[PDB]
């Protein structure tokens, strides 16, 4: 929903303030923009509150409005426009499965159902332990590595039902699995052998025209 209703857990009196170290980070954010245009810092600072707090209560939105001297409504507009802001609490690991056509064509559905069975939840829900939250997202910009998921800040790619269940098993154990493809390649090169960039790259000055 894109309207707010005060609750005991989410209301203007809910405690939130940036830590002393995050205030230092805020100063560097605000210094990135011309003077007289502090409102440009709304997105990075709002994201900073989420990284500290995990999600965005209304009191966190109010604090950002105060620090940057912007009307709170303009901050509410940003919080509700960009989908990476969590206006409700999310589990420790926010699993985000891409289901757009390129990933769908390479069986993102088998990934989605594998997660649902293993965690016993439905898309949109949080586990009772509050460790995992599962949602579908649009193209995450790793289409040649489909099917893939993002968990918090990391991408996990070239997934199969076995691979994702192994990633979730590692997460449940406190281990932090390595990101990237799980199929054998390292990034976006074709499997079965490079079809380009096999020879060593040229060095400084190669092919440089005259006059420089």
């Amino acid at each position: 929903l894109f309207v707010h209703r005060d609750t005991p857990e989410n209301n203007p009196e809910t405690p939130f303030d940036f830590t002393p170290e995050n205030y230092k980070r805020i100063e560097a954010i605000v210094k990135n923009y011309p003077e007289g245009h502090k409102a440009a810092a709304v997105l990075p600072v709002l994201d900073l509150a989420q990284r500290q707090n995990g999600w965005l209560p209304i009191s966190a939105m109010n604090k950002v409005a105060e620090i940057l001297q912007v009307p709170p409504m303009r901050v509410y507009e940003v919080a509700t426009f960009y989908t990476m802001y969590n206006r409700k609490p999310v589990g420790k690991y926010h699993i985000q499965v891409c289901t757009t056509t390129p990933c769908m064509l390479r069986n993102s559905d088998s990934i989605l159902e594998a997660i649902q069975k293993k965690l016993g939840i439905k898309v949109g829900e949080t586990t009772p332990d509050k460790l995992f939250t599962l949602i579908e997202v649009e193209c995450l910009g790793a289409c040649v590595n489909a099917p893939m998921v993002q968990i918090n800040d990391n991408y996990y790619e070239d997934l199969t039902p076995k691979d994702i269940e192994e990633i979730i098993d590692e997460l449940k154990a406190g281990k932090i699995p390595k990101p990237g493809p799980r199929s054998g390649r390292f990034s976006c090169e074709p499997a079965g052998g490079l079809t380009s960039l096999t020879e060593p790259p040229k060095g400084p000055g190669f092919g440089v025209q005259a006059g420089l």
Binding site: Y33, P34, C139, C143, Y155, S187, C188, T195, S196, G207
Partner: protein, 429 residues
């Protein structure tokens, strides 16, 4: 020349595309980056704009405007306002992941491009807008920028050239529409990512209200090489008015989905077979290809037999080069469902600002969802065509066109499939 493709590694620009060599400053310099940057800067903006003009380079962000002419809009006297370069790293087009490889594996190409391109425009700084999901890539770029600052390649007296230049990185927060040039500017300003009407054009009133040029990551990252090796060297690739090398993404129903650099005007068939290992199940198993990302209309196998991958060739085939993100669908695909999911994507991504896309795309999505099940009558096909034409060319920004076009491609080339599905539903009910 009359045949294109088979680009040699000596002529490839992004030589660390696969990240098998050091992506940091030392590896970049060993590969030719940051070489004679001072000389290029001291040549002057008009010389730099001349080389980009002669190179025939066109925008790699999806619209394909001639880059040299576009960048020359900033080559004008100052008026007290600062001038900015905004590098578009939102990379949100479904099927497109080329800009991701440049940022994380060749970051110093992009940083040097910002300085060289910024110098041509007389900008004081560059803001690189990178989508918020590319966290690890943004951090990689941030590390490279610090090395450039420490080495004195950017910042005060960049490359000892007497020209100051800052490179800032700002992350998005989840919005495909923030790849649109004016929506990107609005997002940097702390507002909802809603596009601006034009005029004014960004070269007159842009970010913070100042003269601005928005350029795609790949467009920027190739400019330093064009200056070093010459625009003529770049124009010796691809057909006339389709110059240069191009980064391709081949995904979907291929054997080895991959990113690769190849000559412009390469045949679509040759690209899929040489680099992606061919269509899954053989070329005979091909059904349709989306050649330039979800915003470009699909083309059937018959068209894919001989078409060339460049701006002009794909326009004559009733589509476009777009981002050159090739999405391949074999004959096991439910083509109506594939397209219906793209319309669902545009429904989730429309900013909602202007009426035809706010309401039209959601309307098209509802009709397509029924077309998937066959729960419609054939008269609704011509209705859906007309609706898509009421969105196209009537919206503020090109997202509305980007949603209309995929629907048009489906109806143009697969009307029998849509009608067959309605016939099957009717007998079952």
């Amino acid at each position: 020349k009359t045949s294109f493709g088979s680009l040699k590694d000596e002529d490839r620009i992004f030589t660390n595309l696969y990240g098998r060599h050091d992506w940091r400053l030392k590896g970049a310099q060993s590969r030719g980056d940051w070489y004679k940057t001072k000389e290029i800067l001291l040549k002057g903006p008009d010389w730099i704009l001349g080389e980009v003009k002669t190179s025939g380079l066109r925008g790699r962000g999806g619209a394909g405007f001639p880059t040299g002419l576009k960048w020359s809009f900033m080559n004008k006297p100052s008026d007290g306002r600062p001038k900015y370069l905004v590098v578009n790293a939102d990379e949100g087009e479904p099927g497109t992941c080329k800009d991701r490889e440049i940022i994380r594996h060749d970051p110093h190409k992009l940083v040097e491009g910002c300085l060289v391109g910024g110098r041509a425009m007389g900008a004081r700084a560059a803001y690189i807008y990178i989508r918020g999901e590319f966290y690890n890539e943004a951090s990689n770029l941030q590390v490279a920028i610090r090395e450039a600052y420490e080495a004195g390649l950017i910042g005060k007296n960049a490359c000892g050239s007497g020209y100051d230049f800052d490179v800032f990185v700002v992350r998005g927060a989840g919005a495909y529409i923030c790849g649109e040039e004016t929506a990107l500017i609005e997002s940097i300003e702390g507002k909802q990512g809603k596009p601006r009407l034009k005029p004014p054009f960004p070269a007159d009133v842009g970010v913070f209200g100042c003269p601005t040029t928005v350029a795609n990551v790949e467009t920027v990252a190739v400019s330093p090489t064009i200056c070093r090796r010459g625009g003529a060297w770049f124009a010796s690739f691809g057909r006339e008015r389709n110059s240069g090398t191009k980064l391709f993404n081949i995904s979907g129903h291929v054997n080895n989905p991959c990113t690769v650099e190849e000559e412009m005007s390469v045949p679509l068939k040759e690209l899929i077979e040489k680099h992606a290992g061919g269509v899954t199940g053989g070329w005979d198993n091909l059904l349709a290809v989306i050649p330039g990302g979800s915003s470009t209309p699909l083309i059937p196998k018959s068209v894919c037999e001989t078409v060339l991958m460049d701006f002009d060739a794909l326009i004559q085939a009733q589509t476009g080069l777009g981002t050159a993100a090739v999405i391949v669908m074999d004959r096991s695909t439910d083509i109506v469902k594939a397209i219906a999911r793209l319309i669902e994507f545009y429904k989730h991504e429309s900013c909602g600002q202007c009426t035809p896309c706010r309401e039209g795309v959601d309307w098209m999505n509802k009709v397509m969802a029924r077309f998937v099940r066959g729960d419609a009558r054939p008269a609704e096909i011509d209705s859906l065509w007309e609706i898509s034409k009421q969105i196209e060319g009537h919206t503020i920004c090109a997202l509305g066109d980007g949603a209309a076009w995929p629907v048009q491609g489906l109806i143009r080339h697969f009307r029998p499939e849509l009608e067959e599905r309605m016939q099957q539903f009717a007998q079952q009910h």
